[PDB]
Design a protein around this nucleic acid. Structure first.
Ligand SMILES: [Mg+2]
Length: 425
RNA sequence: GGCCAGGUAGCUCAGUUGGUAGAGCACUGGACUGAAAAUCCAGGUGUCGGCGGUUCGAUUCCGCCCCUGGCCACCA
């Protein structure tokens, strides 16, 4: 299979001129310090796919700290060195960020061994990457500038739309990929080929998913839910039995599946009308239903979660069937008010996950009715001017006139107020 | 530097239809007992992190900061 290709034309045509000049300069610097310079990762992939990619990952063969320190004087900005893994991050004044890493054999020799055929060193660095499409590099050195370097066939997999791991232990080294793969499947329209699907299933069933830290898995989950087709992602994780390994007490049934369908269907509506909605907590709302205190404590400790989330969830699971019967009997909005009263948008999404069709339209209508229709006059300071006073009572009265206003009867103010006061006797 | 969480008495911590402060312990004495391991009934605790805003009124609703913890900052 063909390894090297010429992307130079694609480079100059597609890439932003600023980033391009940065590439040129970095390559030249590399020639000056006798270090081969590459740009690697998602940038290459997106470059082939015609997608804008801001973050740039540079891989040099040599000391990356020396290369960065060398490129700092010529490039305005702030250098942050981490001497652990020999990596540096150079923040340019333009707002761009350059990530520079070291490619070396962990033995090698000094001075730097000259270029070897097939470029073993950089190959060794690209073998550690997750998927073939992210395993490709591009040489920035002026002589070789615009050289696409693909050992593992990431180009072929890019044309055929294939998600493929590098080796059999890929999911063992970084089980987070189990999620990421799925995300990629939904990021583009791509398919996970047979072997890595087997490797994924094996990885999940062997409990490598639980070994990894919570926050990373939560991060990849959040990234998954912000992609284009969340439903297909959730169902994909369901196929691989990922959901129960992430959340032990969550069992994915056709009922829960339908809930997720309604949920993702109604999320754009809530986001439109009620504003920004966290999709992670929106999904956990359905997932974490009927969790006992122990399990909730564990799942909250693993992936850090709001301590008040379980209260909202339990509120929903408390008022859901009653809500169903309310919408079934065409009950006035005054009775549906206390349930959705002070709740978060995520809670509202959860409620919407329980219904479709006529009940959906009705609940949305009542929702928009509650969102609007707030107040005109009277309330507290004006009730001070009147017979009542001193605390809770007047607030109760407020809720009364609000309820009479939500029942469909609205004319003016003190008329409804007088009705309420007459009913207080 | 990025992200996710917390701050409630001296300590560890609960508390959402906004509506006047909560539990165990820290803390003392006595009954039984020469004394103790011990249990019994028990004597009062708050700028609810800081500050604006909405409300008659905010620990709560919201925005901006202070502080603590965790994840991450080769691969990721
Ligand atoms: Mg980067």
């Amino acid at each position: 299979m063909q390894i090297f290709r010429d992307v130079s034309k694609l480079l100059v045509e597609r890439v932003d001129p600023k980033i391009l000049n940065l590439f040129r300069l970095l390559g030249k610097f590399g020639d000056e310090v006798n270090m081969p310079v590459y740009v690697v990762g998602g940038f290459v992939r997106d470059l082939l796919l015609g997608i804008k990619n801001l973050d740039i990952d540079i891989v040099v063969e040599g000391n990356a700290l020396e290369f960065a320190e060398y490129a700092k004087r010529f490039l305005p900005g702030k250098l942050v060195k981490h001497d652990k893994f020999m990596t540096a991050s150079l923040f340019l004044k333009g707002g761009l960020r350059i990530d520079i890493a070291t490619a070396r054999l962990e033995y090698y020799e000094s001075p730097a061994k000259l270029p070897d055929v097939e470029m073993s060193t950089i190959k060794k660095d690209l073998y550690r990457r997750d998927f073939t499409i992210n395993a490709m590099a591009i040489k920035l050195n002026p002589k070789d500038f615009g050289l696409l370097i693909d050992f593992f066939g990431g180009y072929r997999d890019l044309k055929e739309g294939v998600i493929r791991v590098l080796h059999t232990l890929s999911f063992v080294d970084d089980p987070t990929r189990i999620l990421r793969a799925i995300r990629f499947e939904q990021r583009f329209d791509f398919r996970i080929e047979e072997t890595t699907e087997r490797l994924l299933k094996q990885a999940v069933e062997e409990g490598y998913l639980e070994r990894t830290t919570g926050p990373r898995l939560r991060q990849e989950l959040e990234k998954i839910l912000e992609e284009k087709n969340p439903l297909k992602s959730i169902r994909r994780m369901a196929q691989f039995d990922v959901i129960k390994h992430l959340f032990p007490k969550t069992y994915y049934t056709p009922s829960m599946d339908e809930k997720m369908e309604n949920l993702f269907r109604n999320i754009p509506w809530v986001e439109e009308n009620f504003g920004e909605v966290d999709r992670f907590y929106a999904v956990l709302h359905v997932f974490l239903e009927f969790y006992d205190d122990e399990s909730w404590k564990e799942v909250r400790d693993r992936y850090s979660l709001r301590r008040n989330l379980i209260n909202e969830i339990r509120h929903v699971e408390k008022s859901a069937p009653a809500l169903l019967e309310m919408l079934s009997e065409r009950v006035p909005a005054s009775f549906v008010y206390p349930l959705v009263k002070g709740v978060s948008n995520e809670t509202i999404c959860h409620f919407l996950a329980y219904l479709s069709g006529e009940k959906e339209g009705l609940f949305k209508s009542y929702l928009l009715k509650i969102k609007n229709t707030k107040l005109e006059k009277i309330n507290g300071e004006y009730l001070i001017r009147k017979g009542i006073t001193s605390g809770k009572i007047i607030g109760e009265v407020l809720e009364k006139i609000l309820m009479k206003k939500l029942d469909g009867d609205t004319r003016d103010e003190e008329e409804i107020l007088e009705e309420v006061l007459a009913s207080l006797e």
